[PDB]
Design a protein around this nucleic acid. Sequence first.
DNA 1: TCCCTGTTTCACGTGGAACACCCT
DNA 2: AGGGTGTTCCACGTGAAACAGGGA
Lengths: 264, 264, 264, 264
Amino acid sequence: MMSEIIAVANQKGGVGKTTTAVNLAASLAVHEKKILLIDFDPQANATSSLGFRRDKIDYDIYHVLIGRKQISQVILKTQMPFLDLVPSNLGLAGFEKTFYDSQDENKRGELMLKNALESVVGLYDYIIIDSPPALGPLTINSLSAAHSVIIPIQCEFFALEGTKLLLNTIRMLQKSTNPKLKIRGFLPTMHVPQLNLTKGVLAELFKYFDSEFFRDSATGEYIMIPKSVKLAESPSFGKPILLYDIKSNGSIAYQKLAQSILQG
Amino acid sequence: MMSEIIAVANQKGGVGKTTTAVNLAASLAVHEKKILLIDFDPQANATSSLGFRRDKIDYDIYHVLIGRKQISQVILKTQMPFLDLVPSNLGLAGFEKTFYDSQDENKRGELMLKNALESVVGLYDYIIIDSPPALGPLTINSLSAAHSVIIPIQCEFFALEGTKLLLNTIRMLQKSTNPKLKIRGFLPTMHVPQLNLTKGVLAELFKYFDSEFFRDSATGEYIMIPKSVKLAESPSFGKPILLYDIKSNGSIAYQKLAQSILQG
Amino acid sequence: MMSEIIAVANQKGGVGKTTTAVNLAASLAVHEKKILLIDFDPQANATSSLGFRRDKIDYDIYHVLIGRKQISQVILKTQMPFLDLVPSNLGLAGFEKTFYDSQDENKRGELMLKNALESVVGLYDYIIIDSPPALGPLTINSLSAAHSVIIPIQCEFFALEGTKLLLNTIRMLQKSTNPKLKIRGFLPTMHVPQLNLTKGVLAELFKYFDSEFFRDSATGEYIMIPKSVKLAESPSFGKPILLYDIKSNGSIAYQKLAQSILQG
Amino acid sequence: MMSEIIAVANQKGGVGKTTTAVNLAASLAVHEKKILLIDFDPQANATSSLGFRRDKIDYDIYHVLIGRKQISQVILKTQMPFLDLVPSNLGLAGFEKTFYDSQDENKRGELMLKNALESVVGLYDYIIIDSPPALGPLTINSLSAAHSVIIPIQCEFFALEGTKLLLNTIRMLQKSTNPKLKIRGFLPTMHVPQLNLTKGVLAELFKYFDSEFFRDSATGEYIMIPKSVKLAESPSFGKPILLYDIKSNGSIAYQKLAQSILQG
DNA sequence: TCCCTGTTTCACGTGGAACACCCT
DNA sequence: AGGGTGTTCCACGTGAAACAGGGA
Ligand SMILES: Nc1ncnc2c1ncn2[C@@H]1O[C@H](COP(=O)(O)OP(=O)(O)OP(=O)(O)O)[C@@H](O)[C@H]1O
Ligand SMILES: Nc1ncnc2c1ncn2[C@@H]1O[C@H](COP(=O)(O)OP(=O)(O)OP(=O)(O)O)[C@@H](O)[C@H]1O
Ligand SMILES: Nc1ncnc2c1ncn2[C@@H]1O[C@H](COP(=O)(O)OP(=O)(O)OP(=O)(O)O)[C@@H](O)[C@H]1O
Ligand SMILES: Nc1ncnc2c1ncn2[C@@H]1O[C@H](COP(=O)(O)OP(=O)(O)OP(=O)(O)O)[C@@H](O)[C@H]1O
Ligand SMILES: [Mg+2]
Ligand SMILES: [Mg+2]
Ligand SMILES: [Mg+2]
Ligand SMILES: [Mg+2]
């Protein structure tokens, strides 16, 4: 078995990584492929996006990382049979400090998620890592474990400057800890295609990275997640979009994305 | 003269800390008050919004915090004569580790920005601090220096959970490092007033904090930053809203906010 | 006992006079008051709305008006024991010529229904008259017999000229043949409260005649017949609504109107 | 030219005779065919639907009928260059009386409009006569003058029985005054296709007249004018649909009606 | 059989954004 | 260009109507 580990990371906040991670885990699970979703955000927004109470959460990914628990100990099962969740909690914040301690003694600790996943990388088809809004210790784990990264891009101004910096970190890890690391693609999120700022910022990213933009290679048209209030309602009902409204366009786009991920 | 030091912070990403910080700084500056805007985010989105190139930026608040530099050295003057900026860069990220080097050694380092600011706090009326989307060391400095905090709320689902944690952290620092700290107000931003998820999240937040909401005290009415494409186009021109589009509603909103802050 | 003789008239077609007449008669009959419903329309829409067969009906109000029959001869008893019907047929169309013959012969004939009615006017509590869509002879009789008039209003454009014109003709008779005639009230019908044309036409009519709009005198709110497919399904079963579907909103409306008419 | 005369008549009120007449005149005028539209209704709602004043109308179809005027004297020009209007006014009511005087002397007067129209039957391609909600003298004139009749049917209950009666009158004229008379078709109006009452009355009327239903010769499919609030606003701006909102479904439908009429 | 609640589909109103005139 | 004007597109909310188990 070969888990593809796809890290949904992007250091910018509010750009759709928790909406993308949760909902791709879902929309790929319905393709009857076994999905594990890691919640690497100390806010634990993905955990709650699937209906859990972080407050009624005993053991989570932190204790796996430091070795106090096996990752197979913490996995929870979700309302979707094919989607299982490694939940998160505020305790994951501690990991920041933890990380630098290894940085002081043996320059490891980028690869803690790498080791924590090693024991289930054959039990799942896809392991999707929802990353927190930083380029800090946690995000670096997320990338180091990963086969590829999915980059949610909200076509507003700062996502210009932001992206290159992120890619910079990628290359750095591509020369340092994770050689295999590929960009699985760029994913426009919250898309409003008729705004002019969006036309411009998309055009810029096209210029530097059109080859990285997700196309449903079935019809080749670009796959962009539409701004959908329904997409932002779905976690409130402890549900993906698939279980909350399978016919809304948020869902259509995230299933199209899953199709594209699958076609190769 | 004694600057009110006001941190626009919130640990959730994309919620308007940077947009509110830039545009409150500007909308107060035109009111003929001398403002310093600190960019406490390694993303340097506030710097970038005022038209600078982070990449053609020499020394920043990082070198201030490590003592290599004076806070008064790094200040740049902006296209508004009354608004000054302390810029940022990824080097500020390094502070993460620097902070914990204090936590291991003498359990301070909460109050670093407080001390570096000490030398410019009488040279300004308001010091407006744009925070990063975390509860880590940087936001801890950002809050601890501050007299009061402005909490921009994106009225969607997670604004529920997050907010409670944020205030608790506020309460925590009030009982440890900054006892004088006040909540200046909550700030609904990107407001689509007719959406149902918004009505709901506003209702919950009203029940728990209705009095802490920015009111146009002339009419008592709520002050809410409307979703406005122009509010998000303006930094692509390195301009605040009032220099980019003074008549749009994003702008009118921020000047009502600024007026409210001045009235007390 | 002195039956109030209430004419539901309006010169525009399809505005609910036949639906209002049937359903007010029924909603008052359920209040244990004895009601006679005159079908003054050669279409005999009120007749068939109560389940009779215009074709298997022998003698009708025509032969009453020409004296060939007593008004007490043509009355049929209906599916409601307290509701009686003077039925109609196409032969009532003949009366047009006949009217002008009286116009030619003794300058009466507006008051023919009045005369034909004299023999049943104390035998009923309310005598409810479904008028045809004109200001011609039949409607002139119908107003001339009547104590008061109920004007069903379809809140579209032509209700504007139309309304004031109907009121005009009312005043004419009030100064000539039937001065006692009172406007029992105005009744918005088929009411869709959110359409903009309705808002506009209602606002116009309000400015000119708000005091005439039927109010739930219990709660003072307006009485408006909601658009109810069932209100239009009921006559196909030869039934009023309260015999058809008493919990529907059309039904509650007509009963609220009935309460209002009795309430004073 | 040989003017086709199409009388839009049906005795039930509020079934679309006037919205249909006005709008077919318009949708036919735009095929660059010369249209003369008679307002044969004393309410003259067709006149007022074309932006004219009953208040500003000097000579109208009444004075033509009594011979005091030429039809060519009263014709007006409309905002559409290929559509001209013979307007109406409440004085047309007088014609009722007029008709019976001839019934008393030489049993003519069905053929008054026929005679008045005699002078423009080569100057127009189509002359469209909007009838009042009666089977009275005017409606009979309109049918007698006309080559064919267009019958708007609102698929509710009373338009079941009503239809049979109307056809009877056709046959009467077809046997007495007007042998050429054709039913150009039945035209479903205010159509709500998913209501069950509408399905049913359609099914019934299909049963009896399935061959009389207007087919868009393009798809063979039935042409049924949808409930369109915009179709009902159009007279408030003195305009047809095609000048007021040419892309709404009201307009497309009245245009399809125009094409079907044109093919023959 | 009488009822009661979850879903669909559809028109219409609303308010934002782009765009094209248009003043002048 | 700057500073109105209205026209076109789209998402979302609403509320009515047909329908469908589900219910003993
Ligand atoms: N395509 C979309 N349309 C509408 N709303 C969306 C869309 N994608 C995401 N959202 C909403 O945007 C808000 C934040 O997005 P989300 O948390 O998924 O991004 P994030 O980067 O994970 O945030 P953070 O970095 O703070 O964890 C939520 O309300 C989310 O539901
Ligand atoms: N009132 C508003 N209307 C429309 N767009 C807005 C508004 N406020 C902010 N935005 C936009 O939303 C995007 C994210 O917002 P912004 O970066 O101001 O929030 P933030 O707090 O800076 O994010 P971070 O949390 O990472 O600092 C930006 O393109 C910004 O222009
Ligand atoms: N409030 C309502 N909701 C729904 N349908 C209605 C309503 N009121 C009337 N209708 C329907 O509209 C159609 C015509 O209304 P109705 O015939 O009662 O008015 P009318 O004055 O009788 O017409 P006429 O002017 O020819 O006598 C009927 O099938 C009727 O059932
Ligand atoms: N397709 C439609 N959708 C919505 N409203 C409509 C439609 N057609 C007509 N109406 C409106 O319903 C009302 C009456 O229709 P209209 O007067 O054309 O029928 P009518 O037969 O002319 O009435 P009359 O029998 O008194 O002549 C008007 O306000 C009319 O514009
Ligand atoms: Mg998240
Ligand atoms: Mg920021
Ligand atoms: Mg009637
Ligand atoms: Mg008419």
